[PDB]
Amino acid sequence: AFKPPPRPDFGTSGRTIKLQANFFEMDIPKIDIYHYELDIKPEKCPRRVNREIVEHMVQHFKTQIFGDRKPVFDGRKNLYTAMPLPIGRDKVELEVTLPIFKVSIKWVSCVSLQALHDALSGRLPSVPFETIQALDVVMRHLPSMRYTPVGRSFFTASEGCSNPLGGGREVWFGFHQSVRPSLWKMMLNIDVSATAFYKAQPVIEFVCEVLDFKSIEEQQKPLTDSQRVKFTKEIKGLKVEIKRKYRVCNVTRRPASHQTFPLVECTVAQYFKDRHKLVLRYPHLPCLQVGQEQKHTYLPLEVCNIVAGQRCIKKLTDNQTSTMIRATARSAPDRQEEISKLMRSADFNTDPYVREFGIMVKDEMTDVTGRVLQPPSILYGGRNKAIATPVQGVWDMRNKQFHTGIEIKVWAIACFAPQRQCTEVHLKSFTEQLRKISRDAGMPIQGQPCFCKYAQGADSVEPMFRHLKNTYAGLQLVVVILPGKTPVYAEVKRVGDTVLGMATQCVQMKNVQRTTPQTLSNLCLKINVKLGGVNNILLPQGRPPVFQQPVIFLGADVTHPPAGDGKKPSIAAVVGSMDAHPNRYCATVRVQQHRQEIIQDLAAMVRELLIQFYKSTRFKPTRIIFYRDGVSEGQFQQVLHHELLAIREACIKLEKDYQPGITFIVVQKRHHTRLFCTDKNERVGKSGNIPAGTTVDTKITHPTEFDFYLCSHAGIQGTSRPSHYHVLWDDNRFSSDELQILTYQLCHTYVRCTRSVSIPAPAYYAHLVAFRARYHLVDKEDHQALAKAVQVHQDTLRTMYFA
RNA sequence: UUCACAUUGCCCAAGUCU
RNA sequence: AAAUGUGAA
Ligand SMILES: [Mg+2]
Ligand SMILES: [Mg+2]
Ligand SMILES: [Mg+2]
């Protein structure tokens, strides 16, 4: 449960394709560098402040310590130098003055880059973490000064263009930068990015922006509260400057002319007229209470400016979002070009600090050979038992019938949309079309709905469903029409999934008024699965050898609360295959600690899923394939430490000695590796993306470990994110080819569409489950209550309610 | 709430002071 | 999931 397995071999399957990766080769010297630990009192100050302190420090003490040695600083307690310092390691305390600080400089170690060169070969067997860290600190020293660091990215005011979002917000552009070891050479991962920022404008113009004013006046009216309430919500927590900066903690109720503070008591507009000799042009407008809520101070809006690129955590409005989308949307070629020209303009080789450490960065994207894996054949049923052949990640169901289609005899229709908008004629025609498409697909809706009744409000949901369950024997499904976005949906799912155990299929009103064969088809894809039907299976003879023995496939995912929240739970979801196809899955879901990635209650979930697998197949899995979504590198060791063991436990407590082999695969969809077609005649579609099946396990992958990029999806828009798969454990000793082919084929078993999805079907179902859980908890966000809300009905346990 | 793909929001990362 | 856009038998 400790070390990830070494890469067994390289993939051989599929035709080759010339690709370019946004990785940039790094020439690293084979010389020692020097680590130094720093201590700065006080330490409660921000990272950038510490950077400033160290900069001033290096400047001042050039003649007795530093001097022509150009150190790098990680913003905390680490400083690296190329050539050594006058250190014994006799610790020297320095006193620094910043427009008042005590600094401790003590030597720690000599980071060997030669050992890193060894490790990159197979000559060392482990990759030195601290060394990679050092190189990273070096690469991001200068841009941490010149730009605004956000995570591993840097953003800045666009050179004379602007991109306003409204509300005092504008688009800032920038780039993610990272240092990664690879099979070949150190790599600088660079990718273009963009995000929202508050314009460094006067607070007055911010008010104009926020309250939709053309300009103040209209008016000199000391606002409403709708103005005061909204403006206060917008500016609170944001920094404002006058030389002196402050954090806005409140907005006064009284105008500057009247707002009073104890000096005897005095008013703001008067105090600024006496001590500061200024006369307010806009006195009627309120004041900003800055600093501590505790105590007082009050600054007029007219003498305050926003600061200096403050990332705007708050959520973007619908219109702002639309603007951002419109601004940052680009095709794969356009993305590629933007990244390239970014790397040209950046000119890393002239950076004095990377120059100090003898580091070279190639200004060209790395050339890498990919392999385009062959898609599996999708076997259908009915009389024909037709075979669909995925072409560029896509196929369809025309003239195909479900492998096992559910015969719908008893069903109901509940419309919560106003009858004026959704008429019985609309329902009738929609029903006719649906019955036709469903008949074609092999899912015969053989009757008219035994029930059809309009209703309104969430309060009407439970009684209506309770009637339906009690009135119609053998009721298979209730189709619910909804008037757009409504709190009724979450309710329907609450009653259906957790309260009554009834199959419900919702459809927006607009998709009833105007039906199309495609929409209806996909809808049937959902309905059939929801009623226990097998849409289609992988061609049994086209599957990898692993299927010769009974094997279970587990999807696993954790979904965390949105940015800003601090009390909502994280949600764990684990699904498990219930046949040899593999097609049917069952779900398990838990609530757990806020922002905990490690699946706390995993063993129980795996036990449930194994039990259900046995009851479904009468087989005990000899192999457990575990697709774990969302775990970053920095968390691998832990997660595998807890989760892998949790699986073993789950087996151990089930039967001794039941020890099926475990393959633990971390799925990463969200990273900064982008692959582009080298040949223009290879780009697919309008977005010009790499074709589905594109597999990369060389050159840019891990120097010693079992990992691979596999873009399994047809890129419709923008630049495809190739899913990265990292194998943390593998008792079954998969070869690269078998595991990659298996993953790719699994990407074709996703029931909700006749396409090849970007991640394996089980992990996707895991996502859907976690999200449905989040739906059951809406407005319900101690432990026992949330857990209760998240627990499905006994008749829903063994279904695919999440489809 | 037909569906996938993209951008954002989600562990690690970052951010936090006078 | 949600906002926003591209798409589809
Ligand atoms: Mg997740
Ligand atoms: Mg953290
Ligand atoms: Mg959408």
mmCIF file of all heavy atoms in Angstrom, chain A residues 152 489 493 511 522 560 595 635 670 717 750 764, chain B residues 1-2 4-7 9-12 14:
data_model
loop_
_atom_site.group_PDB
_atom_site.id
_atom_site.type_symbol
_atom_site.label_atom_id
_atom_site.label_comp_id
_atom_site.label_asym_id
_atom_site.label_seq_id
_atom_site.Cartn_x
_atom_site.Cartn_y
_atom_site.Cartn_z
ATOM 1 N N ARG A 152 -1.137 28.114 -9.164
ATOM 2 C CA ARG A 152 0.103 27.892 -9.894
ATOM 3 C C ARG A 152 0.140 28.761 -11.144
ATOM 4 O O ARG A 152 1.018 28.618 -11.993
ATOM 5 C CB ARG A 152 0.254 26.417 -10.268
ATOM 6 C CG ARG A 152 0.403 25.489 -9.075
ATOM 7 C CD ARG A 152 0.477 24.032 -9.506
ATOM 8 N NE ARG A 152 0.432 23.134 -8.356
ATOM 9 C CZ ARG A 152 -0.690 22.732 -7.769
ATOM 10 N NH1 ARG A 152 -1.863 23.149 -8.225
ATOM 11 N NH2 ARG A 152 -0.643 21.916 -6.725
ATOM 12 N N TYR A 489 -38.153 20.275 -9.015
ATOM 13 C CA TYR A 489 -37.323 19.157 -9.470
ATOM 14 C C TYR A 489 -36.661 18.422 -8.308
ATOM 15 O O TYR A 489 -36.775 17.199 -8.187
ATOM 16 C CB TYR A 489 -36.250 19.623 -10.460
ATOM 17 C CG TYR A 489 -35.293 18.516 -10.854
ATOM 18 C CD1 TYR A 489 -35.633 17.603 -11.842
ATOM 19 C CD2 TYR A 489 -34.058 18.378 -10.230
ATOM 20 C CE1 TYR A 489 -34.773 16.585 -12.198
ATOM 21 C CE2 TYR A 489 -33.189 17.360 -10.580
ATOM 22 C CZ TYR A 489 -33.551 16.467 -11.566
ATOM 23 O OH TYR A 489 -32.690 15.452 -11.920
ATOM 24 N N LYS A 493 -37.295 14.543 -7.063
ATOM 25 C CA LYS A 493 -36.214 13.606 -6.810
ATOM 26 C C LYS A 493 -36.176 13.169 -5.348
ATOM 27 O O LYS A 493 -35.816 12.040 -5.052
ATOM 28 C CB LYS A 493 -34.868 14.190 -7.244
ATOM 29 C CG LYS A 493 -34.714 14.318 -8.752
ATOM 30 C CD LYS A 493 -34.997 12.997 -9.461
ATOM 31 C CE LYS A 493 -35.086 13.191 -10.971
ATOM 32 N NZ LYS A 493 -35.380 11.927 -11.704
ATOM 33 N N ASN A 511 -39.156 21.043 -24.208
ATOM 34 C CA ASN A 511 -38.825 19.806 -24.906
ATOM 35 C C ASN A 511 -40.057 18.940 -25.134
ATOM 36 O O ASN A 511 -39.975 17.865 -25.725
ATOM 37 C CB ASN A 511 -37.746 19.027 -24.150
ATOM 38 C CG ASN A 511 -36.444 19.798 -24.037
ATOM 39 O OD1 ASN A 511 -36.246 20.810 -24.711
ATOM 40 N ND2 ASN A 511 -35.546 19.318 -23.188
ATOM 41 N N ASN A 522 -32.368 10.135 -26.815
ATOM 42 C CA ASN A 522 -31.585 10.200 -25.586
ATOM 43 C C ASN A 522 -32.474 10.030 -24.352
ATOM 44 O O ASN A 522 -32.097 9.360 -23.380
ATOM 45 C CB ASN A 522 -30.820 11.521 -25.506
ATOM 46 C CG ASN A 522 -29.775 11.663 -26.592
ATOM 47 O OD1 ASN A 522 -29.324 10.676 -27.172
ATOM 48 N ND2 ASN A 522 -29.370 12.899 -26.864
ATOM 49 N N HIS A 560 -16.907 18.565 -3.784
ATOM 50 C CA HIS A 560 -16.741 19.511 -2.685
ATOM 51 C C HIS A 560 -17.642 20.740 -2.833
ATOM 52 O O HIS A 560 -18.025 21.104 -3.946
ATOM 53 C CB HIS A 560 -15.276 19.944 -2.588
ATOM 54 C CG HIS A 560 -14.322 18.809 -2.381
ATOM 55 N ND1 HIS A 560 -14.138 18.206 -1.155
ATOM 56 C CD2 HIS A 560 -13.492 18.174 -3.241
ATOM 57 C CE1 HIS A 560 -13.239 17.245 -1.269
ATOM 58 N NE2 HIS A 560 -12.831 17.204 -2.525
ATOM 59 N N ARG A 595 -14.665 19.425 2.727
ATOM 60 C CA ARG A 595 -13.463 19.466 1.889
ATOM 61 C C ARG A 595 -12.449 18.352 2.166
ATOM 62 O O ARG A 595 -11.248 18.534 1.969
ATOM 63 C CB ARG A 595 -12.795 20.843 1.945
ATOM 64 C CG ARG A 595 -13.730 21.976 1.588
ATOM 65 C CD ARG A 595 -12.972 23.248 1.260
ATOM 66 N NE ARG A 595 -13.877 24.379 1.075
ATOM 67 C CZ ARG A 595 -14.595 24.593 -0.023
ATOM 68 N NH1 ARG A 595 -14.518 23.749 -1.044
ATOM 69 N NH2 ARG A 595 -15.392 25.651 -0.100
ATOM 70 N N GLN A 635 -1.758 14.346 -3.315
ATOM 71 C CA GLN A 635 -2.583 13.583 -2.435
ATOM 72 C C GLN A 635 -2.615 12.130 -2.713
ATOM 73 O O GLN A 635 -3.412 11.484 -2.172
ATOM 74 C CB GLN A 635 -3.994 14.107 -2.454
ATOM 75 C CG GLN A 635 -4.893 13.439 -1.435
ATOM 76 C CD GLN A 635 -6.260 14.062 -1.324
ATOM 77 O OE1 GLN A 635 -6.563 15.081 -1.943
ATOM 78 N NE2 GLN A 635 -7.095 13.453 -0.513
ATOM 79 N N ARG A 670 -8.975 17.333 -14.957
ATOM 80 C CA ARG A 670 -8.602 18.733 -14.820
ATOM 81 C C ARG A 670 -7.129 18.942 -14.473
ATOM 82 O O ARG A 670 -6.735 18.936 -13.307
ATOM 83 C CB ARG A 670 -9.528 19.449 -13.834
ATOM 84 C CG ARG A 670 -10.769 20.026 -14.506
ATOM 85 C CD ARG A 670 -12.016 19.863 -13.660
ATOM 86 N NE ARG A 670 -12.729 21.127 -13.504
ATOM 87 C CZ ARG A 670 -14.007 21.227 -13.153
ATOM 88 N NH1 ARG A 670 -14.725 20.136 -12.931
ATOM 89 N NH2 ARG A 670 -14.571 22.422 -13.031
ATOM 90 N N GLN A 717 -16.179 21.429 -28.857
ATOM 91 C CA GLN A 717 -15.863 22.847 -28.732
ATOM 92 C C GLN A 717 -14.561 23.075 -27.968
ATOM 93 O O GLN A 717 -14.210 22.310 -27.070
ATOM 94 C CB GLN A 717 -17.021 23.587 -28.053
ATOM 95 C CG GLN A 717 -17.023 25.097 -28.258
ATOM 96 C CD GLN A 717 -16.146 25.833 -27.262
ATOM 97 O OE1 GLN A 717 -16.085 25.475 -26.084
ATOM 98 N NE2 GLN A 717 -15.452 26.865 -27.732
ATOM 99 N N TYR A 750 -21.104 4.188 -21.369
ATOM 100 C CA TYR A 750 -21.894 5.216 -20.698
ATOM 101 C C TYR A 750 -23.276 5.315 -21.335
ATOM 102 O O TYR A 750 -23.409 5.709 -22.490
ATOM 103 C CB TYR A 750 -21.160 6.553 -20.783
ATOM 104 C CG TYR A 750 -21.809 7.691 -20.031
ATOM 105 C CD1 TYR A 750 -21.653 7.822 -18.656
ATOM 106 C CD2 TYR A 750 -22.560 8.647 -20.698
ATOM 107 C CE1 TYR A 750 -22.235 8.869 -17.969
ATOM 108 C CE2 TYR A 750 -23.144 9.699 -20.019
ATOM 109 C CZ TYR A 750 -22.979 9.805 -18.655
ATOM 110 O OH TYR A 750 -23.560 10.848 -17.977
ATOM 111 N N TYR A 764 -18.024 8.441 -14.173
ATOM 112 C CA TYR A 764 -19.041 9.388 -14.600
ATOM 113 C C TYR A 764 -20.318 9.192 -13.783
ATOM 114 O O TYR A 764 -20.906 10.158 -13.281
ATOM 115 C CB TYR A 764 -19.313 9.221 -16.095
ATOM 116 C CG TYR A 764 -19.587 10.519 -16.817
ATOM 117 C CD1 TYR A 764 -18.927 10.829 -18.000
ATOM 118 C CD2 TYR A 764 -20.491 11.444 -16.313
ATOM 119 C CE1 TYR A 764 -19.167 12.015 -18.661
ATOM 120 C CE2 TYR A 764 -20.738 12.635 -16.971
ATOM 121 C CZ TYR A 764 -20.073 12.913 -18.143
ATOM 122 O OH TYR A 764 -20.311 14.094 -18.802
ATOM 123 P P U B 1 -33.944 13.717 -14.646
ATOM 124 O OP1 U B 1 -34.963 13.012 -14.040
ATOM 125 O OP2 U B 1 -32.672 13.649 -14.066
ATOM 126 O "O5'" U B 1 -34.288 15.203 -14.969
ATOM 127 C "C5'" U B 1 -33.685 15.829 -16.072
ATOM 128 C "C4'" U B 1 -34.607 16.837 -16.668
ATOM 129 O "O4'" U B 1 -35.030 17.733 -15.639
ATOM 130 C "C3'" U B 1 -33.983 17.714 -17.733
ATOM 131 O "O3'" U B 1 -34.866 17.921 -18.799
ATOM 132 C "C2'" U B 1 -33.870 19.050 -17.045
ATOM 133 O "O2'" U B 1 -34.005 19.931 -18.110
ATOM 134 C "C1'" U B 1 -35.092 19.016 -16.159
ATOM 135 N N1 U B 1 -35.010 19.940 -15.036
ATOM 136 C C2 U B 1 -35.980 20.895 -14.904
ATOM 137 O O2 U B 1 -36.884 21.018 -15.687
ATOM 138 N N3 U B 1 -35.839 21.711 -13.819
ATOM 139 C C4 U B 1 -34.862 21.656 -12.864
ATOM 140 O O4 U B 1 -34.873 22.460 -11.943
ATOM 141 C C5 U B 1 -33.900 20.635 -13.066
ATOM 142 C C6 U B 1 -34.008 19.825 -14.116
ATOM 143 P P U B 2 -34.500 18.162 -20.204
ATOM 144 O OP1 U B 2 -33.611 19.230 -20.170
ATOM 145 O OP2 U B 2 -35.645 18.214 -21.002
ATOM 146 O "O5'" U B 2 -33.685 16.905 -20.635
ATOM 147 C "C5'" U B 2 -34.273 15.634 -20.623
ATOM 148 C "C4'" U B 2 -33.404 14.689 -21.387
ATOM 149 O "O4'" U B 2 -33.720 14.833 -22.781
ATOM 150 C "C3'" U B 2 -31.927 14.968 -21.334
ATOM 151 O "O3'" U B 2 -31.296 14.348 -20.243
ATOM 152 C "C2'" U B 2 -31.465 14.271 -22.589
ATOM 153 O "O2'" U B 2 -31.518 12.886 -22.413
ATOM 154 C "C1'" U B 2 -32.560 14.668 -23.559
ATOM 155 N N1 U B 2 -32.269 15.921 -24.264
ATOM 156 C C2 U B 2 -31.350 15.862 -25.276
ATOM 157 O O2 U B 2 -30.807 14.834 -25.614
ATOM 158 N N3 U B 2 -31.099 17.052 -25.894
ATOM 159 C C4 U B 2 -31.633 18.273 -25.591
ATOM 160 O O4 U B 2 -31.298 19.255 -26.239
ATOM 161 C C5 U B 2 -32.576 18.254 -24.534
ATOM 162 C C6 U B 2 -32.856 17.107 -23.921
ATOM 163 P P A B 4 -24.435 14.060 -20.380
ATOM 164 O OP1 A B 4 -23.906 13.034 -19.585
ATOM 165 O OP2 A B 4 -24.550 15.365 -19.865
ATOM 166 O "O5'" A B 4 -23.506 14.151 -21.622
ATOM 167 C "C5'" A B 4 -22.403 13.287 -21.811
ATOM 168 C "C4'" A B 4 -21.693 13.634 -23.091
ATOM 169 O "O4'" A B 4 -22.638 14.223 -24.004
ATOM 170 C "C3'" A B 4 -20.580 14.654 -22.983
ATOM 171 O "O3'" A B 4 -19.329 14.043 -22.778
ATOM 172 C "C2'" A B 4 -20.565 15.217 -24.382
ATOM 173 O "O2'" A B 4 -20.062 14.187 -25.173
ATOM 174 C "C1'" A B 4 -22.040 15.252 -24.725
ATOM 175 N N9 A B 4 -22.729 16.481 -24.388
ATOM 176 C C8 A B 4 -23.453 16.721 -23.260
ATOM 177 N N7 A B 4 -23.993 17.909 -23.223
ATOM 178 C C5 A B 4 -23.607 18.487 -24.417
ATOM 179 C C6 A B 4 -23.850 19.742 -24.976
ATOM 180 N N6 A B 4 -24.576 20.687 -24.384
ATOM 181 N N1 A B 4 -23.321 20.003 -26.181
ATOM 182 C C2 A B 4 -22.607 19.060 -26.778
ATOM 183 N N3 A B 4 -22.306 17.845 -26.359
ATOM 184 C C4 A B 4 -22.838 17.617 -25.151
ATOM 185 P P C B 5 -18.303 14.738 -21.971
ATOM 186 O OP1 C B 5 -17.118 14.040 -21.759
ATOM 187 O OP2 C B 5 -18.977 15.309 -20.907
ATOM 188 O "O5'" C B 5 -17.902 15.925 -22.886
ATOM 189 C "C5'" C B 5 -16.966 15.690 -23.893
ATOM 190 C "C4'" C B 5 -16.762 16.915 -24.715
ATOM 191 O "O4'" C B 5 -18.037 17.391 -25.158
ATOM 192 C "C3'" C B 5 -16.182 18.068 -23.965
ATOM 193 O "O3'" C B 5 -14.790 17.917 -24.004
ATOM 194 C "C2'" C B 5 -16.617 19.213 -24.840
ATOM 195 O "O2'" C B 5 -15.754 19.117 -25.915
ATOM 196 C "C1'" C B 5 -18.014 18.782 -25.260
ATOM 197 N N1 C B 5 -19.104 19.341 -24.440
ATOM 198 C C2 C B 5 -19.586 20.602 -24.744
ATOM 199 O O2 C B 5 -19.097 21.218 -25.689
ATOM 200 N N3 C B 5 -20.577 21.125 -24.001
ATOM 201 C C4 C B 5 -21.069 20.444 -22.973
ATOM 202 N N4 C B 5 -22.030 21.015 -22.251
ATOM 203 C C5 C B 5 -20.588 19.160 -22.629
ATOM 204 C C6 C B 5 -19.615 18.648 -23.382
ATOM 205 P P A B 6 -13.957 18.465 -22.901
ATOM 206 O OP1 A B 6 -12.610 18.356 -23.061
ATOM 207 O OP2 A B 6 -14.485 18.246 -21.650
ATOM 208 O "O5'" A B 6 -14.156 19.914 -23.404
ATOM 209 C "C5'" A B 6 -13.396 20.928 -22.833
ATOM 210 C "C4'" A B 6 -13.761 22.257 -23.400
ATOM 211 O "O4'" A B 6 -15.081 22.217 -23.958
ATOM 212 C "C3'" A B 6 -13.839 23.327 -22.350
ATOM 213 O "O3'" A B 6 -12.538 23.784 -22.330
ATOM 214 C "C2'" A B 6 -14.786 24.302 -22.989
ATOM 215 O "O2'" A B 6 -14.198 24.820 -24.131
ATOM 216 C "C1'" A B 6 -15.796 23.362 -23.601
ATOM 217 N N9 A B 6 -16.850 22.960 -22.692
ATOM 218 C C8 A B 6 -17.033 21.719 -22.157
ATOM 219 N N7 A B 6 -18.067 21.633 -21.367
ATOM 220 C C5 A B 6 -18.617 22.904 -21.400
ATOM 221 C C6 A B 6 -19.741 23.459 -20.782
ATOM 222 N N6 A B 6 -20.552 22.781 -19.975
ATOM 223 N N1 A B 6 -20.009 24.754 -21.022
ATOM 224 C C2 A B 6 -19.205 25.431 -21.837
ATOM 225 N N3 A B 6 -18.125 25.020 -22.479
ATOM 226 C C4 A B 6 -17.876 23.731 -22.210
ATOM 227 P P U B 7 -12.064 23.717 -20.928
ATOM 228 O OP1 U B 7 -10.656 23.825 -20.901
ATOM 229 O OP2 U B 7 -12.714 22.671 -20.231
ATOM 230 O "O5'" U B 7 -12.765 25.088 -20.637
ATOM 231 C "C5'" U B 7 -12.105 26.293 -20.918
ATOM 232 C "C4'" U B 7 -12.804 27.415 -20.223
ATOM 233 O "O4'" U B 7 -14.197 27.402 -20.592
ATOM 234 C "C3'" U B 7 -12.861 27.354 -18.714
ATOM 235 O "O3'" U B 7 -11.723 27.891 -18.075
ATOM 236 C "C2'" U B 7 -13.984 28.323 -18.453
ATOM 237 O "O2'" U B 7 -13.471 29.590 -18.769
ATOM 238 C "C1'" U B 7 -14.970 27.934 -19.545
ATOM 239 N N1 U B 7 -15.923 26.917 -19.097
ATOM 240 C C2 U B 7 -17.057 27.349 -18.469
ATOM 241 O O2 U B 7 -17.305 28.517 -18.299
ATOM 242 N N3 U B 7 -17.901 26.358 -18.058
ATOM 243 C C4 U B 7 -17.721 25.010 -18.187
ATOM 244 O O4 U B 7 -18.564 24.244 -17.741
ATOM 245 C C5 U B 7 -16.515 24.639 -18.832
ATOM 246 C C6 U B 7 -15.673 25.582 -19.248
ATOM 247 P P G B 9 -12.088 28.274 -11.421
ATOM 248 O OP1 G B 9 -11.304 29.261 -10.704
ATOM 249 O OP2 G B 9 -11.539 26.955 -11.660
ATOM 250 O "O5'" G B 9 -13.445 28.120 -10.634
ATOM 251 C "C5'" G B 9 -13.681 28.882 -9.456
ATOM 252 C "C4'" G B 9 -14.913 28.374 -8.759
ATOM 253 O "O4'" G B 9 -15.904 28.027 -9.747
ATOM 254 C "C3'" G B 9 -14.725 27.088 -7.995
ATOM 255 O "O3'" G B 9 -14.198 27.345 -6.714
ATOM 256 C "C2'" G B 9 -16.147 26.580 -7.891
ATOM 257 O "O2'" G B 9 -16.814 27.179 -6.813
ATOM 258 C "C1'" G B 9 -16.728 27.003 -9.240
ATOM 259 N N9 G B 9 -16.721 25.892 -10.181
ATOM 260 C C8 G B 9 -15.654 25.434 -10.907
ATOM 261 N N7 G B 9 -15.932 24.374 -11.611
ATOM 262 C C5 G B 9 -17.259 24.105 -11.314
ATOM 263 C C6 G B 9 -18.110 23.073 -11.773
ATOM 264 O O6 G B 9 -17.859 22.166 -12.570
ATOM 265 N N1 G B 9 -19.375 23.169 -11.212
ATOM 266 C C2 G B 9 -19.772 24.132 -10.326
ATOM 267 N N2 G B 9 -21.034 24.054 -9.898
ATOM 268 N N3 G B 9 -18.992 25.103 -9.896
ATOM 269 C C4 G B 9 -17.757 25.028 -10.427
ATOM 270 P P C B 10 -13.215 26.243 -6.240
ATOM 271 O OP1 C B 10 -12.528 26.617 -5.009
ATOM 272 O OP2 C B 10 -12.457 25.748 -7.383
ATOM 273 O "O5'" C B 10 -14.280 25.114 -5.952
ATOM 274 C "C5'" C B 10 -14.404 24.577 -4.645
ATOM 275 C "C4'" C B 10 -14.033 23.123 -4.651
ATOM 276 O "O4'" C B 10 -14.889 22.415 -5.565
ATOM 277 C "C3'" C B 10 -12.613 22.783 -5.096
ATOM 278 O "O3'" C B 10 -12.041 21.899 -4.157
ATOM 279 C "C2'" C B 10 -12.826 21.967 -6.362
ATOM 280 O "O2'" C B 10 -11.864 20.957 -6.515
ATOM 281 C "C1'" C B 10 -14.168 21.333 -6.061
ATOM 282 N N1 C B 10 -14.879 20.772 -7.209
ATOM 283 C C2 C B 10 -15.438 19.502 -7.093
ATOM 284 O O2 C B 10 -15.324 18.895 -6.022
ATOM 285 N N3 C B 10 -16.088 18.967 -8.146
ATOM 286 C C4 C B 10 -16.198 19.656 -9.280
ATOM 287 N N4 C B 10 -16.848 19.088 -10.295
ATOM 288 C C5 C B 10 -15.645 20.958 -9.426
ATOM 289 C C6 C B 10 -14.999 21.473 -8.375
ATOM 290 P P C B 11 -11.515 22.405 -2.783
ATOM 291 O OP1 C B 11 -12.626 22.851 -1.950
ATOM 292 O OP2 C B 11 -10.396 23.299 -3.025
ATOM 293 O "O5'" C B 11 -11.001 21.032 -2.197
ATOM 294 C "C5'" C B 11 -9.788 20.983 -1.454
ATOM 295 C "C4'" C B 11 -9.289 19.568 -1.379
ATOM 296 O "O4'" C B 11 -9.743 18.839 -2.544
ATOM 297 C "C3'" C B 11 -7.784 19.412 -1.400
ATOM 298 O "O3'" C B 11 -7.283 19.454 -0.085
ATOM 299 C "C2'" C B 11 -7.642 17.995 -1.916
ATOM 300 O "O2'" C B 11 -8.012 17.094 -0.906
ATOM 301 C "C1'" C B 11 -8.732 17.956 -2.976
ATOM 302 N N1 C B 11 -8.253 18.350 -4.317
ATOM 303 C C2 C B 11 -7.182 17.647 -4.865
ATOM 304 O O2 C B 11 -6.662 16.741 -4.205
ATOM 305 N N3 C B 11 -6.730 17.979 -6.091
ATOM 306 C C4 C B 11 -7.311 18.969 -6.769
ATOM 307 N N4 C B 11 -6.840 19.253 -7.982
ATOM 308 C C5 C B 11 -8.407 19.699 -6.239
ATOM 309 C C6 C B 11 -8.848 19.356 -5.024
ATOM 310 P P C B 12 -6.515 20.699 0.449
ATOM 311 O OP1 C B 12 -6.359 20.570 1.920
ATOM 312 O OP2 C B 12 -7.167 21.904 -0.126
ATOM 313 O "O5'" C B 12 -5.077 20.554 -0.218
ATOM 314 C "C5'" C B 12 -4.342 19.343 -0.116
ATOM 315 C "C4'" C B 12 -3.305 19.236 -1.199
ATOM 316 O "O4'" C B 12 -3.928 18.886 -2.465
ATOM 317 C "C3'" C B 12 -2.534 20.506 -1.511
ATOM 318 O "O3'" C B 12 -1.501 20.775 -0.577
ATOM 319 C "C2'" C B 12 -2.029 20.237 -2.922
ATOM 320 O "O2'" C B 12 -0.901 19.373 -2.902
ATOM 321 C "C1'" C B 12 -3.211 19.475 -3.529
ATOM 322 N N1 C B 12 -4.115 20.360 -4.301
ATOM 323 C C2 C B 12 -3.750 20.705 -5.608
ATOM 324 O O2 C B 12 -2.687 20.264 -6.071
ATOM 325 N N3 C B 12 -4.560 21.508 -6.333
ATOM 326 C C4 C B 12 -5.695 21.962 -5.802
ATOM 327 N N4 C B 12 -6.461 22.754 -6.554
ATOM 328 C C5 C B 12 -6.094 21.627 -4.474
ATOM 329 C C6 C B 12 -5.283 20.830 -3.765
ATOM 330 P P A B 14 0.763 27.036 -1.703
ATOM 331 O OP1 A B 14 2.195 27.220 -1.342
ATOM 332 O OP2 A B 14 -0.156 26.426 -0.706
ATOM 333 O "O5'" A B 14 0.130 28.432 -2.145
ATOM 334 C "C5'" A B 14 0.309 28.934 -3.462
ATOM 335 C "C4'" A B 14 -0.942 29.601 -3.972
ATOM 336 O "O4'" A B 14 -2.027 28.642 -3.987
ATOM 337 C "C3'" A B 14 -1.469 30.752 -3.134
ATOM 338 O "O3'" A B 14 -0.803 31.971 -3.423
ATOM 339 C "C2'" A B 14 -2.954 30.773 -3.481
ATOM 340 O "O2'" A B 14 -3.172 31.448 -4.712
ATOM 341 C "C1'" A B 14 -3.244 29.282 -3.681
ATOM 342 N N9 A B 14 -3.815 28.645 -2.478
ATOM 343 C C8 A B 14 -3.161 27.917 -1.514
ATOM 344 N N7 A B 14 -3.952 27.480 -0.569
ATOM 345 C C5 A B 14 -5.208 27.941 -0.940
ATOM 346 C C6 A B 14 -6.478 27.809 -0.349
ATOM 347 N N6 A B 14 -6.702 27.145 0.788
ATOM 348 N N1 A B 14 -7.529 28.391 -0.975
ATOM 349 C C2 A B 14 -7.305 29.060 -2.114
ATOM 350 N N3 A B 14 -6.161 29.255 -2.765
ATOM 351 C C4 A B 14 -5.142 28.660 -2.118
#
